[PDB]
Ligand binder design. Structure first.
Ligand SMILES: CCCCCCCCCCC(=O)OC[C@H]1O[C@H](O[C@@H]2[C@H](O)[C@@H](O)[C@H](O)[C@@H](O[C@H]3O[C@H](CO[C@H]4O[C@H](CO[C@H]5O[C@H](CO)[C@@H](O)[C@H](O)[C@@H]5O[C@H]5O[C@H](CO)[C@@H](O)[C@H](O)[C@@H]5O)[C@@H](O)[C@H](O)[C@@H]4O)[C@@H](O)[C@H](O)[C@@H]3O)[C@@H]2OP(=O)(O)OC[C@@H](COC(=O)CCCCCCCC[C@H](C)CC)OC(=O)CCCCCCCCCC)[C@@H](O)[C@@H](O)[C@@H]1O
Ligand SMILES: CCCCCCCCCCCCCCCCCC(=O)OC[C@H](COP(=O)([O-])OCC(O)COP(=O)([O-])OC[C@@H](COC(=O)CCCCCCCCCCCCCCCCC)OC(=O)CCCCCCCCCCCCCCCCC)OC(=O)CCCCCCCCCCCCCCCCC
Ligand SMILES: CCCCCCCCCCCCCCCC(=O)OC[C@H]1O[C@H](O[C@@H]2[C@H](O)[C@@H](O)[C@H](O)[C@@H](O[C@H]3O[C@H](CO)[C@@H](O)[C@H](O)[C@@H]3O)[C@@H]2OP(=O)(O)OC[C@@H](COC(=O)CCCCCCCC[C@H](C)CCCCCCCC)OC(=O)CCCCCCCCCCCCCCC)[C@@H](O)[C@@H](O)[C@@H]1O
Ligand SMILES: CCCCCCCCCCCCCCCC(=O)OC[C@H]1O[C@H](O[C@@H]2[C@H](O)[C@@H](O)[C@H](O)[C@@H](O[C@H]3O[C@H](CO)[C@@H](O)[C@H](O)[C@@H]3O)[C@@H]2OP(=O)(O)OC[C@@H](COC(=O)CCCCCCCC[C@H](C)CCCCCCCC)OC(=O)CCCCCCCCCCCCCCC)[C@@H](O)[C@@H](O)[C@@H]1O
Ligand SMILES: CC(C)=CCC/C(C)=C/CC/C(C)=C/CC/C(C)=C/CC/C(C)=C/CC/C(C)=C/CC/C(C)=C/CC/C(C)=C/CC/C(C)=C/CC1=C(C)C(=O)c2ccccc2C1=O
Ligand SMILES: CC(C)=CCC/C(C)=C/CC/C(C)=C/CC/C(C)=C/CC/C(C)=C\CC/C(C)=C/CC/C(C)=C/CC/C(C)=C/CC/C(C)=C/CC1=C(C)C(=O)c2ccccc2C1=O
Ligand code: HEC
Ligand code: HEC
Ligand SMILES: CCCCCCCCCCCCCCCC(=O)O
Ligand code: FES
Ligand SMILES: [Ca+2]
Ligand SMILES: [Cu+2]
Ligand SMILES: [Cu+2]
Lengths: 149, 299, 56, 223, 115, 139, 73, 152
């Protein structure tokens, strides 16, 4: 019964902090924002980094990533955003990586745990991912010691 | 008619396939002749030896015919002996291996797809020489005491790797490109379980085994030549797991000049899909298409 | 039922039966009446097996 | 080391592309994406022998490992090179840390295990049954590194325990309780599987009552 | 076989998955060669063979009855792999190696098939 | 019982010839030398018929012509008690249940269930062996 | 019941009215059907309940019809 | 606790704590913290739904704004008989009670989908303060724990 068309190991998604998205023919994997936090909100003007991996499903042609827009600020793409035929396009350097990067200039406060919409277009698609804020291998921030009460 | 007596066998694209089909038609003719005689005898006694509704006395009670029993024992022995000789003659031709082949193909089977590599290309006329052996990655699997003759079951040194390799994908049927009219050597090596390298147009298949040398299995077979160009489908025939039925491949046959050109783009870093398009060939397989990922229509 | 099968001279196969009570004119016994008590079914429980022999 | 990354991709091309694809994007309805999983996920999934899977069911069960220790490191590095992620702890020699992961405070680990771990498993970590078909496996065969990576990565249905939710000191103390409780002999005799009343009642009916009834028929009479 | 035959009627998986189909022919062959064909060889033999040779019974009446129950409980164990979440054996009745291996057949359905 | 032993000797000769021929035909022609898994079975297949055939030969030379071994034998020649045949027994179903319990334990690898099955098998087999030998209760 | 059906008819309780078993069979199937009213989202168990209820109803009907026609008593 | 302390698909039991409760170093503070640990209706499960699965979340009436983005807070006490139901499966989003096998669909406001449970687990509204620490956004809108004759 559990080995039928509806399985519990085939429908299982990725156990990470990213979002799986399909931009027509390019698959977006582990889409997350890296943003160290100190206060409840990340104030506007703070520079954060958007990290994801673009996979080209088609193995015949190539694709190039342009015009990443979101309602959190301005997103700047630096480097060769062209994905090969049957290769990957890794943008940013996540923790545990021993050069294309996405730079975001905030205009409104953001915080961990919420979802913020992002638009990804390469040549034949306009899809929304709702990118969250994910913390990598950073250690737990210290908590002030409470008093006697 | 050879089209009806073959019982659906493909015509064949290799001289060994043509010889194998000739044996099949003759054996089918011999089998039908024997079957018709036995069926005729059964039908004759079922329609003319039925209890007549006026025959009082029981029929003659005979159950021993020594001259007849010996005659109907030697005759079947003669037929199988004749078939056995042709069986031995054909199998010797099909399993013959030329000491100096011109194209060597490394066939790697896994769960659940195929990987094709070009081990060595050396045309008989000397118009194309190539060496695809890549010893810098075959010896990276050494693992050593060991449970079996000093090596772990994960030794994997029997596997062969090449600089130019066609890797199958769940969304891309692997395509093997071979020259027309050229001798092809196939080296079969599995990775985890047994698979089956079957091309129906080849009229021949051999099971892909892990560690064939340790299993005393001759995993190398050759074809004299391919007599025509086109695309031919290939299926996995030995049961290997969940996706045994969804790991088919395609064999593409092109002209020797087209084959020589195709290797050039592959050496130039081009993938299999774009290299095929560079020689005016479809980038994807046409005889077979990748199976849908949807476990079914109810998903 | 003793479990012993005997072949009669004419080829009949019969099983030797041990009556639990009185017997009628010929071999077959007269049927007894149920009394609510267990009835033996194994000949070894009736002492037909004898004794192995006194000793260590 | 470029040799390690190339070797890992060489294993991936022949073992994992069927369900995860060539670029680790994941084959829909066949396997998820391996981007961002990290070396720790691959190391645990291969050392425990869970991967490569063979069919789709409620859970892929454990089985003997398909690759040796050298091949696991190469496979983990290749996946780590794509998307990053958590990494397995290592000792000074560069091997996988086994003894150094044992915590020195088991009392804290026991309470942490009871609060966070003894729900799906039992107190002594014998296992348990999940919703439908799924089940939590026994913890008596997992080495400390495997437990650490399981906490880091959160296998199929296991809440991921980040280094912030559970600090490495807490994780080291948790595995200390798991490793200790596995090899402590039972004090009152045979452990009877360490499941509680369920084996106790079955053992009672099959031993004490069988002996008591069998003795009674010896003393008593039939009919 | 009817489930298999009705699935191989039209191309594509309409109501059966690959794993279910793989379990289907393995269990079908195992049941219909070893749980139906082999026992009925002794099914007819316990019927007429003592009669044919003019015998009152079989050589070992107790052992003859043991074969029936041993077979019946052995057949039920192998079929009982279907109720397992993983499923019954899915590697075919020839159970080739190393497909029947713990690495390639880790479920309890294959183990119940062997025993 | 001359014919009974002749049947096994005929099989013994063919099995011995096949084992010797196939061993010597794979040592010089099969790839890898002698086919071991394959030859060992053929050699010990001969032993199966050899053991039964030899025992039947020894038994035949001891006993004279049986009523069933006589070409023209009379029905009355075989008159008399044949032996002991069990009329009824519920022990065989318990032995099968005991063996199946161990098999399920072995299939699922449950050491407690395997031990219970082995103990059940011994207990069930003991009942079968002692069924027609237990004496009357001594009270 | 009499001696030929139950040999120990006079030695204890040996007869159960057929109405109790027939009504109990209908209530057995009714309880199987009503259990479909639950929080379960799957329908595999629902079909198992329907099949068992149908089998029980068929057995009860078969017995009642045979008893009415006099084939069995 | 801060929202970033838990990754997607994780679960961790939380307890009601106040500044006046203290760190437990003093005798009075330890007694105050004892009732928090011994509170029958105190434990609460904090789960982080994966962002890719956020479109499958069904909100309960009156509890739509009870989540802080992808963070959901559900009571750890099973609504059937009071056992702690903390067998949260991250992929199936099913909360299993180990006492009598009750399953709750975390996506559909912890609605029971199996077992003898007939009422969904109470949802605790959550938010963050100025310092970024997760705090409660009020009290439960329904009683927590097993039902009684005078409930609802
Ligand atoms: C015969 C049997 C067959 C069945 C038929 C007969 C019975 C059917 C007839 C009725 C009957 O059943 O009676 C027996 C029962 O009686 C007494 O129950 C009554 C009533 O029924 C209960 O429902 C009620 O809950 C009890 O109030 C308590 O909560 C009240 C609040 O709750 C309301 O809110 C709840 C939840 O919401 C709120 O939650 C929290 C509350 O603050 C806050 O979080 C928050 O405020 C939230 O509100 C939100 O609201 C809005 C949101 O939209 C917004 O505004 C805001 O956002 C806000 O946040 C709901 O869940 C509830 O349902 C309810 O609605 C508090 O207000 C109270 O202070 C108190 O705490 C209440 O008790 P009381 O008033 O104290 O006493 C009165 C008197 C009983 O009268 C009778 O008729 C007795 C006679 C008939 C019965 C039989 C006895 C006589 C026969 C002879 C003796 C035989 C010889 O007492 C007694 O004499 C009882 C004595 C013992 C019994 C002896 C039997 C004999 C012994 C031997 C056998 C209790 O004793 C029970 O134990 C007992 O069973
Ligand atoms: C294994 C199969 C072994 C049985 C094969 C019997 C062939 C001989 C035919 C015969 O005469 O039937 C006798 C008789 C047939 O019943 P019957 O119809 O009344 O015949 C009337 C005879 O004329 C009345 O003759 P009898 O009452 O004088 O009894 C004759 C019996 C005398 O019986 C005995 O006294 C001892 C036999 C006890 C069986 C050994 C216990 C097995 C448990 C193994 C535990 C270790 C693990 O002699 C034998 O049957 C030869 C058996 C020699 C022992 C071989 C043990 C092999 C076990 C190997 C372990 C693997 O059956 C028996 O007495 C013993 C049969 C045992 C059945 C159990 C099979 C399942 C065991 C599972 C083992 C796996 C453990 C996990
Ligand atoms: C008159 C009658 C009255 C008297 C009757 C009473 C008799 C009682 C019999 C037993 C007495 C033993 C006393 C000494 C106890 C002892 O000092 O013991 C040490 C340790 O040993 C076990 O450690 C194993 C390893 O050593 C560890 O390394 C390993 O880690 C551990 O594994 C656990 O832990 C892992 C994580 O660490 C998990 O991964 C893993 O999964 C698991 O949980 C292991 O344990 P485990 O597998 O439990 O058992 C393994 C058992 C294998 O089973 C068994 O003995 C089963 C048999 C007994 C059990 C009780 C009966 C139960 C009945 C059945 C369930 C029936 C069910 C059938 C259903 C049918 C009907 C239903 C419809 O092997 C053995 O001991 C071999 C010993 C064999 C002894 C045989 C007895 C001799 C009798 C001879 C009599 C002669 C008398 C003649 C006079 C004339 C554990 O116990 C430990 O706690 C314990 O500390
Ligand atoms: C002659 C005697 C008996 C004869 C019987 C023999 C032949 C019977 C044929 C039955 C067909 C079997 C097909 C097998 C393959 C299979 O299973 O593939 C179907 C798919 O189905 C499910 O997907 C559904 C969709 O396809 C998806 O699109 C959808 O998403 C999904 O929805 C879930 O999931 C969503 C999230 O995705 C949620 O949102 C959503 O809410 C929900 O939870 C769906 O699921 P769901 O509705 O649960 O239906 C599941 C299956 C259900 O299987 C079953 O037959 C279960 C087994 C029932 C068999 C009955 C038992 C027999 C009784 C006993 C033996 C009695 C003993 C006798 C006594 C002694 C003898 C004396 C007489 O339906 C069917 O097959 C059709 C039912 C028709 C069967 C008819 C038989 C009824 C009994 C009649 C008896 C008459 C007797 C009268 C005599 C006079 C998933 O599982 C998939 O993976 C799976 O692939
Ligand atoms: C005989 C009887 C129960 C009559 C009652 C009649 C009546 C008035 C009925 C109406 C009342 C109703 C509705 C009752 C329903 C039943 C019920 C829910 C009962 C509640 C309490 C109660 C009265 C229980 C009775 C239990 C009982 C009489 C058990 C008999 C079992 C016997 C006689 C065993 C001895 C035989 C023997 C030595 C066997 C080998 C040992 C084995 C394998 C026993 C089986 C076995 C058992 C019995 C366990 O309890 C058990 C518990 C936990 C784990 C495992 C087991 C287990 O394996
Ligand atoms: C109400 C309910 C829960 C039932 C549904 C589940 C269900 C169907 C029960 C059976 C589960 C089984 C047996 C599945 C495996 C497949 C299978 C072979 C089953 C059917 C096969 C079949 C029809 C016939 C084959 C022959 C046959 C009839 C015999 C089967 C022999 C066996 C092994 C039966 C026992 C099954 C069973 C449910 C008993 C469990 C006994 C219990 C409760 C013990 C608990 C227990 C545990 C858990 C320990 O860890 C332990 C550790 C150390 C010492 C002791 C124990 C111990 O006793
Ligand atoms: C199809 C049979 C697969 C093969 C081939 C491989 N994996 Fe896999 N993997 C598969 C599934 C259905 C899942 C999700 C649920 C599960 O069964 O685990 C996975 C998951 C992983 C993971 C964990 C992902 C996470 O987010 O934690 C890893 C690390 C992983 N797979 C690695 C892996 C490796 C190394 C493989 C080659 C040995 C491999 N997978 C093959 C299914 C399949
Ligand atoms: C239910 C949600 C669980 C909780 C709570 C804990 N674990 Fe778990 N565990 C669970 C499952 C479903 C699995 C197997 C998943 C799979 O893909 O097979 C596991 C596995 C482990 C293991 C591996 C043991 C082995 O393979 O030998 C370990 C070491 C482990 N789990 C440890 C562990 C710890 C330390 C926990 C508390 C923090 C814990 N688990 C909780 C289910 C669940
Ligand atoms: C009678 C048994 C029929 C079984 C049909 C379903 C096969 C797949 C079961 C698992 O999953
Ligand atoms: S107590 Fe939670 S399910 Fe009954
Ligand atoms: Ca179909
Ligand atoms: Cu295959
Ligand atoms: Cu195959």
């Amino acid at each position: 019964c559990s080995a039928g068309q509806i399985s519990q190991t085939t429908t299982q998604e990725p156990a990470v902090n990213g979002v799986n998205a399909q931009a027509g023919q390019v698959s977006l994997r582990n889409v997350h924002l890296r943003a160290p936090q100190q206060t409840d909100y990340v104030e506007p003007g703070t520079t954060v980094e958007l990290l994801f991996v673009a996979a080209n499903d088609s193995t015949e042609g190539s694709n190039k990533l342009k015009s990443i827009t979101s309602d959190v600020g301005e997103v700047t793409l630096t480097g060769d955003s062209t994905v090969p035929a049957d290769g990957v396009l890794i943008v940013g350097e996540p923790d545990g990586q021993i050069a294309v990067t996405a730079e975001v200039e905030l205009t409104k406060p953001i915080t961990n745990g919420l979802l913020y919409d992002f638009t990804f277009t390469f040549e034949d698609g306009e899809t929304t991912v709702a990118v969250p804020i994910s913390a990598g291998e950073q250690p737990r921030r210290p908590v002030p010691p409470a008093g006697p009460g | 008619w050879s089209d009806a007596l073959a019982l659906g066998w493909p015509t064949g694209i290799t001289p060994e396939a043509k010889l194998n089909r000739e044996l099949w038609i003759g054996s089918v003719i011999a089998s039908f002749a024997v079957g018709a005689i036995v069926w005729g005898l059964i039908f004759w006694t079922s329609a003319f030896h039925r209890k007549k509704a006026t025959d009082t006395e029981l029929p003659r009670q005979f159950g021993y015919n020594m001259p007849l029993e010996l005659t109907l024992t030697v005759i079947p022995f003669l037929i199988i002996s004749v078939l056995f000789y042709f069986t031995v003659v054909v199998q010797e031709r099909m399993m013959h291996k030329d000491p100096n082949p011109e194209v060597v193909i490394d066939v790697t089977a896994f769960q659940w797809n195929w990987k094709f590599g070009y081990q060595k290309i050396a045309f008989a006329d000397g118009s194309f020489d190539y060496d695809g052996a890549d010893p810098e990655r075959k010896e990276a699997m050494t693992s050593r005491v060991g449970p079996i003759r000093g090596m772990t079951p994960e030794d994997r040194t029997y596997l062969n790797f090449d600089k130019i390799e066609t890797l199958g994908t769940s969304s891309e049927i692997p395509v093997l490109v071979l020259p027309a009219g050229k001798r092809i050597e196939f080296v079969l090596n599995s990775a985890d379980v047994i698979h089956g390298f079957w091309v129906p147009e080849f009229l021949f298949k051999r099971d892909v085994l892990p560690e064939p040398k340790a299993n005393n299995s001759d995993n190398v077979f050759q074809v004299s030549e391919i007599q025509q160009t086109g695309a031919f489908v290939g299926r996995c025939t030995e049961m290997c797991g969940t996706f045994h039925a969804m790991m088919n491949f395609e064999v593409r046959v092109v002209e020797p000049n087209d084959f020589k050109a195709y290797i050039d783009q592959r050496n130039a870093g081009k993938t299999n899909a774009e290299a095929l398009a560079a020689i005016n060939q479809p980038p994807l397989a046409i005889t077979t298409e990748p199976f849908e990922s949807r476990r079914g229509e109810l998903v | 039922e003793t479990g012993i099968i005997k072949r009669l001279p004419h080829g009949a196969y019969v099983e030797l039966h041990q009556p639990l009570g009185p017997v009628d004119e010929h071999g077959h016994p007269i049927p007894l009446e149920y009394a609510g008590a267990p009835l033996p079914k194994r000949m070894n429980k009736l002492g037909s097996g004898g004794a192995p022999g006194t000793g260590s | 080391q470029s040799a390690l990354l190339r070797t890992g991709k060489q294993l991936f091309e022949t073992s994992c592309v069927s369900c995860h694809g060539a670029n680790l994007q994941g084959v829909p309805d066949r396997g998820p994406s391996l981007i961002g999983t990290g070396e720790a996920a691959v190391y645990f999934q291969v050392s425990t022998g869970r991967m490569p899977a063979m069919r789709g069911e409620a859970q892929a069960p454990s089985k003997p490992p398909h690759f040796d220790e050298s091949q696991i490191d190469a496979l983990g590095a290749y996946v780590q090179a794509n998307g990053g992620g958590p990494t397995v702890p290592r000792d000074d020699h560069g091997a996988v840390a086994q003894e150094s992961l044992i915590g020195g405070d088991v009392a804290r680990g026991g309470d942490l295990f009871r609060l966070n771990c003894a729900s799906c498993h039992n107190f002594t970590g014998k296992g348990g049954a999940l919703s439908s078909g799924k089940y939590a496996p026994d913890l008596g065969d997992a080495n400390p590194a495997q437990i650490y990576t399981a906490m880091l990565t959160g296998p199929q249905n296991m809440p991921k325990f980040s280094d912030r939710q559970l600090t490495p000191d807490e994780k080291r103390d948790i595995v200390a309780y798991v490793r200790e409780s596995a090899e402590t002999p039972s004090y009152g005799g045979y452990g009877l599987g360490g499941f509680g009343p369920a084996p106790e009642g079955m053992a009672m009916w099959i031993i004490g009552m069988v002996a008591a009834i069998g003795v009674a028929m010896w003393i008593g009479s039939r009919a | 076989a009817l489930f298999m035959r009705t699935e191989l009627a039209m191309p594509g998986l309409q109501f059966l998955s690959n794993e279910q189909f793989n379990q289907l022919f393995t269990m079908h062959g195992t049941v219909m060669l070893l749980f139906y064909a082999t026992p009925i060889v002794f099914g007819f033999a316990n019927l007429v063979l003592p009669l044919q040779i003019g015998a009152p019974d079989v050589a070992f009446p107790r052992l003859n009855a043991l074969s029936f129950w041993l077979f019946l409980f052995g057949a039920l164990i192998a079929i009982a792999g279907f109720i397992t979440p993983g499923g019954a054996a899915d590697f075919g009745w020839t159970a080739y190696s190393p497909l029947t291996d713990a690495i390639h057949s880790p479920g309890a359905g294959g183990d119940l098939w062997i025993m | 019982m001359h014919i009974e032993a002749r049947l096994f000797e005929i099989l013994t000769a063919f099995f011995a010839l096949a084992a010797v021929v196939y061993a010597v035909l794979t040592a010089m022609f099969a790839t890898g030398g002698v086919e071991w898994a394959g030859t060992t079975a053929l050699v010990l297949t001969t032993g199966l018929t050899l053991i039964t055939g030899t025992f039947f030969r020894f038994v035949a030379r001891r006993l004279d012509t049986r009523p069933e071994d006589y070409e023209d034998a009379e029905i009355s020649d075989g008159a008399g008690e044949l032996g002991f045949f069990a009329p009824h027994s519920w022990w065989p179903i318990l032995i099968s249940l005991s063996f199946s319990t161990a098999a399920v334990g072995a299939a699922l690898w449950l050491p407690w269930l395997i031990a219970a099955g082995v103990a059940f098998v011994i207990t069930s087999v003991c009942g079968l062996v002692f069924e027609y030998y237990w004496g009357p209760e001594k009270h | 019941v009499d001696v030929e059906d139950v040999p120990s008819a006079e030695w204890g309780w040996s007869h159960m009215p057929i109405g109790v078993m027939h009504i109990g069979g209908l209530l057995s199937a009714a309880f199987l059907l009503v259990m479909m009213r639950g929080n379960h989202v799957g329908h595999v168990e629902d079909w198992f309940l329907i099949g068992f209820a149908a089998v029980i109803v068929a057995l009860v009907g078969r017995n009642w019809w045979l008893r009415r026609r006099g084939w069995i008593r | 606790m801060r929202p970033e302390d838990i990754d997607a698909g994780g679960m961790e039991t939380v307890f009601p704590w106040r500044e006046s409760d203290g760190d437990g170093t003093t005798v009075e503070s330890e007694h105050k913290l004892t009732e928090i640990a011994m509170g029958v209706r105190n434990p609460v499960m904090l789960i982080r739904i994966k962002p890719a699965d956020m479109h499958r979340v069904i909100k309960r009436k009156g509890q739509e704004s009870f989540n802080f983005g992808e963070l959901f807070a559900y009571t750890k006490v099973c609504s059937h008989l009071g056992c702690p139901s903390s067998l949260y499966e991250q992929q199936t989003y099913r909360i299993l009670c180990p006492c009598h096998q009750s399953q709750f669909d975390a996506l559909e406001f912890a609605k029971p989908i199996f077992g003898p449970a007939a009422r969904a687990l109470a949802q605790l509204p959550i938010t963050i303060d100025e310092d970024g620490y997760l705090v409660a956004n009020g009290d439960f809108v329904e009683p927590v724990g097993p039902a009684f004759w005078e409930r609802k």
